[PDB]
Ligand binder design. Structure first.
Ligand SMILES: Nc1nc2c(ncn2[C@@H]2O[C@H](COP(=O)(O)OP(=O)(O)O)[C@@H](O)[C@H]2O)c(=O)[nH]1
Ligand SMILES: [Mg+2]
Ligand SMILES: [Mg+2]
Ligand SMILES: [Zn+2]
Lengths: 204, 27
């Protein structure tokens, strides 16, 4: 059996929590591969689905996004992507369209998930009502908190369903993750989820 | 005769002598 795997590029402004996020997956971290020419770590993240293992080879930068766009080689042959921003920093959301542009310039219409990270932080700045980019671009959106594992699996499950072409694909179990470093209040989580539902009904 | 880069895991064509992504040579 040839293993099913996908190159996933993880992009977004410096400081949004991309590295923290990819590192939640323990085996992905222990089996990560360094790519010296591009200054990239590729984390092989296996998920066990009802139709067998799927591997997302996640490309994480070494911080170079702080200084400009990423090189073509970073994006090349990506089959899917996650664009991350930080819900405590509005400018990171303002830069989402730039990331999307740079991405599609090299990769075109691959499946993409937009993730708003750091929702564990009480003083949230970018709320559901303001999160709109995905609605206009065909993209799926999730709130996440890398530090608490909140919604960790969501982007990967949505991408798996899209790539495989199976809307009923399920993960059999969560991968082994680093234990939460901060607690994600279940009440706040419920509220945030509801706020997104409300926002989805708004016109434009 | 496609091959998987052992450095970055990208799949390359048989035509390619080095990885289209990371520039590593084919074994
Ligand atoms: N509170 C909180 N802090 C986070 C979270 N994710 C990342 N951070 C912090 O944000 C800072 C930047 O994280 P990093 O993963 O290096 O961001 P990157 O530059 O996009 O890779 C670090 O100090 C992290 O500890 C999160 O989910 N919650
Ligand atoms: Mg980083
Ligand atoms: Mg695991
Ligand atoms: Zn390569």
């Amino acid at each position: 059996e040839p293993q099913v795997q996908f190159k996933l590029v993880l992009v977004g402004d410096g400081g949004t929590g991309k590295t923290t996020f990819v590192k939640r997956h323990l085996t992905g971290e222990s089996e990560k591969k360094y790519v010296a020419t591009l200054g990239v770590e590729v984390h092989p993240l296996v998920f066990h689905t009802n139709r067998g293992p799927i591997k997302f080879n996640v490309w994480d930068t070494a911080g170079q996004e702080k200084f400009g766009g990423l090189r073509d080689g970073y994006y090349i042959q990506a089959q899917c992507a996650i664009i991350m921003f930080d819900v405590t920093s509005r400018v990171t959301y303002k830069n989402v369209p730039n990331w999307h542009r740079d991405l599609v310039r090299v990769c075109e219409n691959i499946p993409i998930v937009l993730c708003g990270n750091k929702v564990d932080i009480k003083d949230r700045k970018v709320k559901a009502k303001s999160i709109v980019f995905h609605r206009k671009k065909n993209l799926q959106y999730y709130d996440i908190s890398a530090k608490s594992n909140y919604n960790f699996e969501k982007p990967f499950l949505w991408l798996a369903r899209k790539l495989i072409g199976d809307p009923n694909l399920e993960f059999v179990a969560m991968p082994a993750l680093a234990p939460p470093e901060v607690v994600m209040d279940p009440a706040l989580a419920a509220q945030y989820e509801h706020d997104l539902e409300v926002a989805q009904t708004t016109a434009l | 005769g496609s091959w998987d880069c052992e450095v970055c895991l990208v799949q390359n064509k048989a035509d390619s002598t080095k990885c289209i992504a990371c520039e590593s040579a084919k074994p």
